Amino acid sequence: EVSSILEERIKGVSDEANLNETGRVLAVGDGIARVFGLNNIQAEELVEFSSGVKGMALNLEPGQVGIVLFGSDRLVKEGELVKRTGNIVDVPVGPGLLGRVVDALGNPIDGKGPIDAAGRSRAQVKAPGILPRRSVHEPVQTGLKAVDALVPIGRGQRELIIGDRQTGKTAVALDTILNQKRWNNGSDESKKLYCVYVAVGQKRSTVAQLVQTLEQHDAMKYSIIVAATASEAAPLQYLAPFTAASIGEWFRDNGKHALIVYDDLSKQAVAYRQLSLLLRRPPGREAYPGDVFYLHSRLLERAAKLSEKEGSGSLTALPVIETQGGDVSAYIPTNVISITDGQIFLEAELFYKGIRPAINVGLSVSRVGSAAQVKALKQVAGSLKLFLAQYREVAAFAQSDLDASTKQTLVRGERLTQLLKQNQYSPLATEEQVPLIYAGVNGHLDGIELSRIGEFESSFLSYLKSNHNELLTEIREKGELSKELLASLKSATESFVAT
Amino acid sequence: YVAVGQKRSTVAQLVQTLEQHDAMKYSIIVAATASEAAPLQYLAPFTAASIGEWFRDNGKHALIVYDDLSKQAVAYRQLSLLLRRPPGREAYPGDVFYLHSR
Amino acid sequence: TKAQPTEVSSILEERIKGVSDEANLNETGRVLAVGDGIARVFGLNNIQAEELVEFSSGVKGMALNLEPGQVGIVLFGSDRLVKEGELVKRTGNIVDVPVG
Amino acid sequence: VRYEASLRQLEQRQLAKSVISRVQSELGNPKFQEKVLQQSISEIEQLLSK
Amino acid sequence: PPPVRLFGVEGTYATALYQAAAKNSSIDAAFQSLQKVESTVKKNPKLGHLLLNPALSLKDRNSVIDAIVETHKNLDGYVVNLLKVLSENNRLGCFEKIASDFGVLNDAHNGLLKGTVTSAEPLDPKSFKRIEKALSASKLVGQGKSLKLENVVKPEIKGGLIVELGDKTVDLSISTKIQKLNKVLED
Amino acid sequence: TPITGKVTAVIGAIVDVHFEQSELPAILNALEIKTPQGKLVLEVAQHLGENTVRTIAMDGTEGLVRGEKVLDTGGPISVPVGRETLGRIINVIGEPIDERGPIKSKLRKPIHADPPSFAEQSTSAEILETGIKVVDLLAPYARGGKIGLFGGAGVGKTVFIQELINNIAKAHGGFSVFTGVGERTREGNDLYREMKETGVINLEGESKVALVFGQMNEPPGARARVALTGLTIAEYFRDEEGQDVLLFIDNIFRFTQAGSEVSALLGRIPSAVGYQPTLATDMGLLQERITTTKKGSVTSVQAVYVPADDLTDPAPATTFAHLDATTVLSRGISELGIYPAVDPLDSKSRLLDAAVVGQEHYDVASKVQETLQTYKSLQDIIAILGMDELSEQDKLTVERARKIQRFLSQPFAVAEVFTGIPGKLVRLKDTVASFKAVLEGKYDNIPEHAFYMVGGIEDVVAKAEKLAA
Amino acid sequence: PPSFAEQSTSAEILETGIKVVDLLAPYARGGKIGLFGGAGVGKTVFIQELINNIAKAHGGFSVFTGVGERTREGNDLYREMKETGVINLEGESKVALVFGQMNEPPGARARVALTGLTI
CATH class of the missing domain: 1.10.1140.10 (Bovine Mitochondrial F1-atpase; Atp Synthase Beta Chain; Chain D, domain 3)
Structure with a gap:
């Protein structure tokens, strides 16, 4: 039993070492070691210490090489013999990482056996060229009202999720993974996404709750979790997003569409800050490293939708930024904002005031996310983003003599706000969203007083299915409204609104 | 008119304006454009001053526009730091006040 | 451990070899590092402060640091002309301008 | 079931300490001497294989 | 350039010394004389560390130098110029440092490649010889560059041996294998 | 006899070489280390003496073995320019990354070049109409001018630039250079497609536009010399072909950033905020290598990512100095929803x-x-x-x-x-x-x-x- | 820190006799509950109450770890804790005390927490 496993392990140690290169450590501590020898070292190689810890050589200096310890100092001792792994930092990539929690080294921390991995691939890689890019057109459906049409997202698309600390930031992303349960339980490989959830700087307990949540929603079988908890060493945390992105590229380079959510890159910044300071390189702007822009940009631009010639794959990217004090002006947030296309800023006041999730639309933008859209949800939702940023203006000066024109807009705006609201961990069909948006745009939610708007919505959906699921089936296949669908929606909406 | 740190185009426009008002017929333009070396920029106010003193020496009256001394200070900041000159000074080295005062 | 600007190996080996230059420690001196438009030349011990020094490239540079062995001569030109080991011969004049 | 799993872990640490006890025995023996000879001849084979 | 540039400060002195005596030849002579005065310097207790340590002027240092060249009149002259250099740079705590380095460069020039076979215990002379033979017949020391090899005894290593030289090592100790074995059965 | 050297150090992407030969390549010379991944182009930036130069490395470092052979290419990287540049997207090294195959080189010119003389300058004044209401009313542009944006969100900056390209460059018939320093690969692809679509690039046809594109993922050092390359292409049209050109540069904050990144590694104790203690000189050269000489008129458009939107930061400040007109774009006006997001109290033009x-x-x-x-x-x-x-x-x-x-x-x-x-x-x-x-x-x-x-x-x-x- | 595996997959609400606590912010296993407010509101009494509750609720233990604890307060805490019998000489002792001292070096301030954690 336990004896057999022990026997397997003893048998599993075989062959005496054959090595012909080493260095011996000089001074060690501060998570940097200075090694004597290793003159044949490759740059940014992975080296293995006799303590068994491994590190990446950063500074190759004429007399010393400065390893960076991916691990804890207690393990290492001065004057130990470091032998070169012989490989640049690579991490196992392959199909069998699917449904496995792993740490950033690729050691399965779910411990569901040794990882089945096709290859290993270097952590840093240059992003696909201009010619390897084909402009986006396939959307990812989020099942969240505003996200899935007012701030729509594509496939391969890089769009920020920014907002206040522990506003359950994570939940927005989880919902996307859940919405794509039937897409990923789909048989169409084009519709299959493979989602990687990178948990950086997070409590190991919290991550375990997330894992359990995902496994409760049986979503684990289509998803990988990479974990880099707070306890894990700060350089290891630094290397954590890069490594995760390599795994994503293996899926991408199968030409298969995917998604990676990097929660939270703000903790990568603090990690890189720690590393930089411990490398005694002068503090950058706002005391965050001077190469922090480079750190993020090299990470971020790996997300792509490969050109049709060179595959078709994608690796969608949504990186989750923990805004300190919720003020988007700040070096780390602005640097990310400039890299990303579109933002999903969330407003705390609204969050508290029961918009779950509270998608601020003043600071949420989406640029090339709206080039991947369901045409039906483009037709119904046209300019509604503008209307509700007229609602924002109107209520700005509402708090005064209100012209009837403004009052009408305010009345619509408020009623629309009720429509926006979603209930966390309940994803909505795209088809189902089309009638709901038609109603509000065409101002039929005047017909339901604001308090009962929520009642109307659920009842309306029940009505729509019972009255004619034919419309929704049509929107399910056609995905583009026709005059018949438009009329059917006018007719159906008026009919339900009346009752 | 002393022009430190300014682009040739700006200076060129100024001379065009001055030539339009036919006032270059009594003016001197000492220039050290942004392109021109940081030492040459540092040296530019003090040698403009010397030109001024020649007017003073003649007993004549003259007026010197030092635009911008701030750009002299940036130039001296870069010069000092490139010299390994020790104080940051809040980003401008100690002794910048001595430079300007003299 | 101290690192002196006279521990430059070409200087240091010449001293060990006994025989060493003089006069290139008066009116001449040999560049040894130069980059950032800021040279450091070895020699020139007859240099007066603020003097203008003619680099053999043809660059003219004032001297703003007289260090304990290496005179730090600020170039008036681009360093893509200047290059290591050049001779610089002291103009012997602090900067001056024509006035009229 | 929970205690059954716990018992597997408990057994693993018990047999681990038995391994430590075996280590103390090994480094005592002049197997310590004889296995140095084994290492020696192996190192000869390795270094000759280079 | 010198055989093996060790780099490092104080080895800039060594490098300088090496090339200076290399171009005038007689490097062995220089090294030998330097060793001889160095050895009697260590075996002279005041100016064995109690006047090798700074607390002296340039001038007081200079008079120490004058006493040093009394100690073995005629060294090799390059190393007498080196003493002058050391006085002028006012370093003498890194005097033995230079001596060791000049030796490394010198015996590199000779091609005498000293190695080491750290072990837990003093090893058999048959073991010494067999390892030396193997090592000479290995790729690692192909021979052409002379082999010196020193077994040293270090208690910390528990069993086995590690052969080292050229930053190329074969570490076939017992302690490490035990460590790895223990670790793998602690998993 | 190519100068051979060894790689003494690899401290970041600021590799140091030790040439064994007494021959010493001068500052701003270029060296090629033949990489097993291709080649790495390095550019000599300091001489530290003892035959040890310190070189900026223009391609992504890794796998460097200290001692690897160096070869002296000599002088700054010399790109190949011609009319043949038109209809190419070219990498920092000038090699077509749009796979139009090697340019049929006419004249190959060093990336670094001295900025035109005071005498050379000629001051234009012709109105260049934009058709944007705010631009026209508040800050009328001029043809040959240096136009400026000071946006904080690149999402807005790119759109603004795109509009300018859409209006001005179709009206304009002369050559035009788009140089995009450190900008998003996806956005770059959008431009390439769009340009090809609007025929300005017609690959089968002819292109009156040339493109240089520098991705923000490219190593900092590469980003530093993307700009200089573009200025050379522009200079070739302006001078050598004499044609009246256009130039777009976005994001020129990245030029500043890249310098700040290298500065520490170079061995320079950083100036205030973090910007390099060489900021004024480096910026100065760049903005005076963009000029409307008496041999040509190059209307230039510069886009600045003001970090944290703090204009008071010295790096945006030193950008403000070399621009004829600026049209600062700010988050507040964006929140007001007004596109264009031009501040109406923070715009000025010489015109x-x-x-x-x-x-x-x-x-x-x-x-x-x-x-x-x-x-x-x-x-x-x-x-x-x-x-x-x-x-x-x-x-x-x-x-x-x-x-x-x-x-x-x-x-x-x-x-x-x-x-x-x-x-x-x-x-x-x-x-x-x-x-x-x-x-x-x-x-x-x-x-x-x-x-x-x-x-x-x-x-x-x-x-x-x-x-x- | 314990392994990923060793983390428990659910957080159960730890009961406290205080209804107010159990209503408006339920405590739970492995929880970090961050007190806000100022001493003199009854901070010490609130803490003491929790110790009492824990003894009835679970019969667990406690360790009052005081990071750079004010020695005046420390005397008081020891006296109060003795008085309320959560520490009683030969009697029952639930809470174990580790009191930090600001006079002790900064290093010893850093290590007091780790000592408590081990216990």
Whole structure:
């Protein structure tokens, strides 16, 4: 039993070492070691210490090489013999990482056996060229009202999720993974996404709750979790997003569409800050490293939708930024904002005031996310983003003599706000969203007083299915409204609104 | 008119304006454009001053526009730091006040 | 451990070899590092402060640091002309301008 | 079931300490001497294989 | 350039010394004389560390130098110029440092490649010889560059041996294998 | 006899070589280390002596073995320029990354070059019409000028630039250079497709545009010399081919950033904030290598990512110095939803003089500025005490100003999709007339929302009819 | 820190006799509950109450770890804890005390927490 496993392990140690290169450590501590020898070292190689810890050589200096310890100092001792792994930092990539929690080294921390991995691939890689890019057109459906049409997202698309600390930031992303349960339980490989959830700087307990949540929603079988908890060493945390992105590229380079959510890159910044300071390189702007822009940009631009010639794959990217004090002006947030296309800023006041999730639309933008859209949800939702940023203006000066024109807009705006609201961990069909948006745009939610708007919505959906699921089936296949669908929606909406 | 740190185009426009008002017929333009070396920029106010003193020496009256001394200070900041000159000074080295005062 | 600007190996080996230059420690001196438009030349011990020094490239540079062995001569030109080991011969004049 | 799993872990640490006890025995023996000879001849084979 | 540039400060002195005596030849002579005065310097207790340590002027240092060249009149002259250099740079705590380095460069020039076979215990002379033979017949020391090899005894290593030289090592100790074995059965 | 060397150090991407030969390549020379991945181009930046130069490394470092052979390419990287550059997207090294195969080189020129002389300069003054309402009224551009944006969100900056390309470069017939320093690969692909679509690039046909594109993922050092390459391509058209050109540079904050990144590694104790203690000189050279000489007129457009939107940061500040006109774009106006997001109290142009655009134009603009400044001034008072409880004179001003603010809007054509409103491009002559009327309160009698997000005065009237229904 | 595996997959609400606590912010296993407010509101009494509750609720233990604890307060805490019998000489002792001292070096301030954690 336990004896057999022990026997397997003893048998599993075989062959005496054959090595012909080493260095011996000089001074060690501060998570940097200075090694004597290793003159044949490759740059940014992975080296293995006799303590068994491994590190990446950063500074190759004429007399010393400065390893960076991916691990804890207690393990290492001065004057130990470091032998070169012989490989640049690579991490196992392959199909069998699917449904496995792993740490950033690729050691399965779910411990569901040794990882089945096709290859290993270097952590840093240059992003696909201009010619390897084909402009986006396939959307990812989020099942969240505003996200899935007012701030729509594509496939391969890089769009920020920014907002206040522990506003359950994570939940927005989880919902996307859940919405794509039937897409990923789909048989169409084009519709299959493979989602990687990178948990950086997070409590190991919290991550375990997330894992359990995902496994409760049986979503684990289509998803990988990479974990880099707070306890894990700060350089290891630094290397954590890069490594995760390599795994994503293996899926991408199968030409298969995917998604990676990097929660939270703000903790990568603090990690890189720690590393930089411990490398005694002068503090950058706002005391965050001077190469922090480079750190993020090299990470971020790996997300792509490969050109049709060179595959078709994608690796969608949504990186989750923990805004300190919720003020988007700040070096780390602005640097990310400039890299990303579109933002999903969330407003705390609204969050508290029961918009779950509270998608601020003043600071949420989406640029090339709206080039991947369901045409039906483009037709119904046209300019509604503008209307509700007229609602924002109107209520700005509402708090005064209100012209009837403004009052009408305010009345619509408020009623629309009720429509926006979603209930966390309940994803909505795209088809189902089309009638709901038609109603509000065409101002039929005047017909339901604001308090009962929520009642109307659920009842309306029940009505729509019972009255004619034919419309929704049509929107399910056609995905583009026709005059018949438009009329059917006018007719159906008026009919339900009346009752 | 002393022009430190300014682009040739700006200076060129100024001379065009001055030539339009036919006032270059009594003016001197000492220039050290942004392109021109940081030492040459540092040296530019003090040698403009010397030109001024020649007017003073003649007993004549003259007026010197030092635009911008701030750009002299940036130039001296870069010069000092490139010299390994020790104080940051809040980003401008100690002794910048001595430079300007003299 | 101290690192002196006279521990430059070409200087240091010449001293060990006994025989060493003089006069290139008066009116001449040999560049040894130069980059950032800021040279450091070895020699020139007859240099007066603020003097203008003619680099053999043809660059003219004032001297703003007289260090304990290496005179730090600020170039008036681009360093893509200047290059290591050049001779610089002291103009012997602090900067001056024509006035009229 | 929970205690059954716990018992597997408990057994693993018990047999681990038995391994430590075996280590103390090994480094005592002049197997310590004889296995140095084994290492020696192996190192000869390795270094000759280079 | 010198055989093996060790780099490092104080080895800039060594490098300088090496090339200076290399171009005038007689490097062995220089090294030998330097060793001889160095050895009697260590075996002279005041100016064995109690006047090798700074607390002296340039001038007081200079008079120490004058006493040093009394100690073995005629060294090799390059190393007498080196003493002058050391006085002028006012370093003498890194005097033995230079001596060791000049030796490394010198015996590199000779091609005498000293190695080491750290072990837990003093090893058999048959073991010494067999390892030396193997090592000479290995790729690692192909021979052409002379082999010196020193077994040293270090208690910390528990069993086995590690052969080292050229930053190329074969570490076939017992302690490490035990460590790895223990670790793998602690998993 | 190629200068051989060894790689003494690899401390970041600031590799140091030790040439074994007594021959020493000078500063700004270029070296090629033959990489098993290709080649690495390095550029000598300091001589540290003892035959140890310190070199900026222009391609991604890794796998470097200390001692690897160096070869001296000599001098700055010399790109190949010609008319053959037109219709190519070229990498930092000048090799076509759009796989148009090697350029049929005419003249190959070093990336670094000295900036044209004071004598060479010639001052233009011709109006260059934009058709953007705010641009035309408040800060009229000139042809050959140096135009500037100081955006904080690149999402807006790219759109602004795209609009400018859409308007100005179709009207323009001469050569045009797009140089995109450190910008998003996806955005770059969009431009490449769009340009090819609008025929400006016609690959089978001919292209009157050339492109240099530098991705923000490219190592910092690479980004540093993307700019210099583009300036060389531009210089070739301006000088050697004599043609009147255009140039777009975005994001030139990245030029600044890259310098700041390398500076520490180079061995320079950083200046304030973090910007390199060589900031003024480096910026100076770059912005004086962009010029309208008497051999050609190069209208240049520079886009600055103001970090944290703090204009007071020295790096944006030193950018402000070398620009003829600027049109600072800010988050507040973005929040107000107005696209274009141009601050109307933070724009200036050298051409705003009445001697240029006429007294009537200047007077109209004067009133707009004064009115808006009043409106900004009473923002405090409006909040503390009701806007109703403001003076009668002021309430007219406030109502006018609310209208003016909304009026300044104008849907973009390129982003007609993104806005979701069919684009509006309006004549400069029409703009002055329209604002004049509005200032005379002629159309002050119809909804405030009728001025919102729409173009010309006629459109406002029509939108009143739409609203009236 | 314990392994990923060793983390428990659910957080059960730890009961406290205080209804107010159990209503408006339920405590739970492995929880970090961050107190806000100022001493003199009854901070010490609140803490003491929790110790009492824990003894009834679970019969667990506690360790009051005081990071750079004010020695005046420390005397008081010891006296109060003795008085309320959560520490009683030969009697029952639930809470174990580790009191930090600001006079002790900064290093010893850093290590007090780790000592408590081990216990």
